[PDB]
């Protein structure tokens with residue numbers, strides 16, 4: 001029997017354009033799809049289905065088989081009510097406290113279960129052709145698709161059974177399902193951990209479904225770092241109150257007057273100045289306030305999460321996740337044949353998966369890059385099975401240094 | 405007449421919430437009613453339409469117009485209402501083939517399908533909504549009443565369902581001929597293979613046959629067209645291609661209409677003729693009076709059109725595509741944010757060409773544009789060939805490396821090589837990383853009043869110098885830039901500058917070399933002239949050394 005699915009009212013199905021794909025990715029998808037057609041997973045469809053959802057080919061960390069990856073960003077928004085406030089999957093707060101988290105692809109699970117016939121149409125997708133030789137090859141799903149948030153929503157109750165024996169036997173283990181993946185965290189020694197996971201893949205294995213190691217407790221701050229130095233220059237002070245100036249607004253108590261008074265009248269930037277004792281009382285005060293969590297800022301579950309990212313050059317990238325601008329939930333850096341787009345890709349994935357472990361939802365990314373470039377290039381490096389939402393921005397001049 | 409394919413049918417539907425059309429038939433003249441009656445009885449004889457009683461409640465207007473010249477009448481059906489009630493269909497095609505993406509084939513033949521829509525059936529429970537009525541003389545007699553069985557012209561689903569139906573039919577013939585290319589465009593098929601006339605003409609026959617088993621008729625040899633196929637604006641010879649004759653009007657006085665047409669034509673000429681330029685011409689269009697209004701040619705515009713004329717003397721053609729070789733794309737800076745490109749496979753034998761202009765933003769420099777163009781071309785290559793080209797660009801690997809590295813925005817170009825084809829792409833000034841010992845620090849500020857729209861711009865330096873200019877229709881933004889300009893005019897070869905405007909900081913920090921703003925351009929010449937310039941930012945309204953001082957200076961009277 002099929003759990004019938006409803007669209008969020010008045011609004012209706014996704015009609016997203018399909019991106020041009022290169023010949024190799026097209027072939028790989030033709031292959032993949034011919035095969036899942038033979039297995040009854042998808043079916044050719046007719047003109048009379050006006051829906052569409054983009055499709056791409058990716059790789060995934062070590063592998064030489066292409067994977068199919070369908071972008072259901074649209075669809076997921078149009079079904080937010082079904083998968084989120086109707087079949088919601090509760091995020092366990094404990095997950096972030098474990099010493100190790102392993103991520104397992106559980107996506108092959110969904111192909112067991114058939115999809116409510118009156119919903120299949122919303123899953124339409126198209127394999128394009130080159131130079132428009134031929135019409136795309138259109139298809140839709142007969143089963144729960146990878147990448148649609150409804151799939152684990154529905155599959156939830158079978159997943160509970162698969163794991164019941166294993167949960168019973170390791171009650172200090174946290175397993176959380178987000179989209180196509182399982183998150184498993186334990187406080188065990190690294191050997192016993194890799195062992196428990198080995199053991200958990202047999203339970204999975206007995207039911208069809210057939211890796212990735214995170215360390216969340218060892219995720220620590222990115223403190224807005226001010227310099228330590230002998231011989232402070234006019235400029236350095238300017239920079240200093242600059243950075244400091246902006247640290248207040250989010251950091252409660254940051255003060256500058258002492259520091260500020262240092263520079264008075266109209267003097268050369270290179271002029272060296274002596275740092276009066278009262279000034280150092282701020283540096284210090286500031287320094288300590290500056291290493292700590294914010295105070296005032298709490299995850300509100302009803303609000304969207306934002307992430308902004310800045311290029312710091314020589315292969316490093318800073319970022320901040322927040323809900324109200326400035327009210328920082330988390331800040332971080334990411335560091336690295338590796339170009340900008342490749343790097344920006346790695347970071348987006350890494351922030352997204354942290355964000356998944358911590359809040360059980362993914363951020364909308366502000367991306368310091370031209371749409372078109374990003375859109376043409378992102379899949380060469382993408383490996384995740386989900387896709388976060390993103391927009392394109394023009395990193396402010398100063399935001400860069402202040403998080404430097 | 406025109407067989408109606410055995411194939412299965414496409415279950416059409418109407419929009420949720422909506423029933424079929426019920427629109428009143430306007431009273432027609434006798435000749436019109438007659439003509440319609442001849443037409444409708446003929447179509448009915450051929451299976452195209454069918455009689456129904458007045459029990460069916462739906463109706464769609466019919467008309468009949470005669471003809472400019474000949475004496476045959478046409479039936480017209482106003483499908484506006486049914487169209488607005490029919491479900492949406494899938495976007496038929498998304499992109500048309502480009503000649504330069506056409507694989508070079510030994511032989512190709514064109515097969516247009518005769519009476520396309522009429523050769524394919526219509527979902528049975530949908531015929532009913534296609535009801536129309538030939539009326540009688542005046543009112544009296546109930547009209548004659550019909551409904552479609554095939555795909556009606558002018559109905560929303562016809563292009564889609566036809567295309568779908570032709571896909572289904574082609575499938576199995578593709579299967580047992582994987583090495584034969586069949587382009588589907590609308591109601592044409594274009595077929596090419598790498599075989600000697602012999603088994604070509606045969607294979608095509610075998611196709612024609614396969615189609616007919618399926619109710620679709622196509623011309624025989626003798627009726628199929630001969631190359632050069634004039635298709636979709638293009639000319640398609642067996643070993644090259646080109647755009648059809650472009651001929652540029654010689655007139656005393658150009659109307660806006662005359663210029664729009666020209667730009668269209670030159671634009672269309674650009675995909676194979678290199679060097680084509682269009683900016684002097686487009687500028688004329690900005691602001692424009694009537695369509696029938698004469699715009700005098702600018703001197704710079706006369707200069708553009710003339711250069712274009714010399715390109716178009718003597719035709720240029722382009723070649724076809726060989727998938728076993730790479731694509732090379734070469735780009736050249738033509739000038740005023742104008743860029744020109746060529747794709748080829750074998751050196752100087754071009755597949756196509758183009759230009760790029762599109763001002764991305766308000767201020768930019770050549771490295772940014774150069775890379776915008778690479779983006780644009782990369783994308784165009786995926787669409788056409790299914791792969792990106794190897795680039796050859798008039799920018800040194802070092803210029804490029806400096807810029808990508810030090811710039812805040814993420815950047816990437818595919819595979820590229822330098823090529824020494826002036827003008828070379830270069831950055832025209834760098835700012836310092838550190839303040840210039842023994843150079844004068846100017847502190848700059850600007851302020852404007854939100855009502856009067858008046859403003860003051862000035863500076864005070866660390867050598868006692870000072871200045872304040874007044875400005876009459878400004879904004880804060882303009883005053884802040886003005887301030888920085890001032891500071892550059894009176895500053896001599898090495899200045900340190902400090903501002904509280906993130907705005908100007910941003911602009912200048914991106915090494916603009918062109919701008920929409922005269923002021924930003926003035927700033928650019930200064931900066932280029934300078935030897936060392938360092939620029940720095942402080943927050944405002946936190947009494948800071950020089951800043952507190954200019955702030956009050958430029959405030960006086962403004963705020």
Ligand SMILES: N#Cc1cc(Cl)cc(Oc2cc(Cl)cc(OCC(=O)Nc3ccc(S(N)(=O)=O)cc3Cl)c2)c1
Nearest residue numbers: 501506508509510511512594596631633635641642724
């Ligand atoms: N879109 C489109 C479109 C539109 C129309 Cl009207 C026709 C069309 O046919 C094609 C199809 C293909 Cl697979 C390649 C191609 O051009 C390159 C080529 O090799 N041509 C070519 C080769 C031999 C001859 S002969 N000796 O048979 O006359 C004629 C020609 Cl054109 C042209 C494509």
